[PDB]
């Protein structure tokens, strides 16, 4: 449980986007946003797995229901 599970990745959302949006808490060692391979479009389900539990946790608790590209992202409990 060292990650933020962020459903709601906008159109212009990349792995860099999630890693930078969660890195100010802690160093994102892995990241990716799951796209149906029929679209090349992020679908609103992403994983930013950093190295620090405190980091990922305070980020999941802080950035809850935010707005990015005008679209609401929600970074919550990765299970």
């Amino acid at each position: 449980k060292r990650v933020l599970y962020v459903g709601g990745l906008a159109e212009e959302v990349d792995d860099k986007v999630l890693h930078a949006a969660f890195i100010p808490f802690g160093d994102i060692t892995d990241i990716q946003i799951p796209l149906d391979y029929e679209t090349e479009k992020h679908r609103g389900f992403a994983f930013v797995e950093f190295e620090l539990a405190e980091d990922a946790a305070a980020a999941i608790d802080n950035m809850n229901e935010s707005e990015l590209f005008g679209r609401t992202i929600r970074v919550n409990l990765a299970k």
Binding site: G8, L9, A10, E11, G44, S66, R71, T72
Partner: protein, 82 residues
Amino acid sequence: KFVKIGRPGYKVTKQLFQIDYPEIAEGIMPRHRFMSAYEQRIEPPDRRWQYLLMAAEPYETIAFKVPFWTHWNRETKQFFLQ
């Protein structure tokens, strides 16, 4: 069956979603939810964008695109979600 659709508006700013609303004088606090954009009386194509809506009794609810952690201050009539 007693759902009076008065048509007041949603006067809120996103950016953390805040609304102003009138006082219905009821113990119901606003209930919010974000869902998929598949239910409507038209359903225009390109339905992958979703409706995040916080609705209540006396106000037109604060809904929007959206591809506890909140509250409503009643004596001040102001709704905050963070």
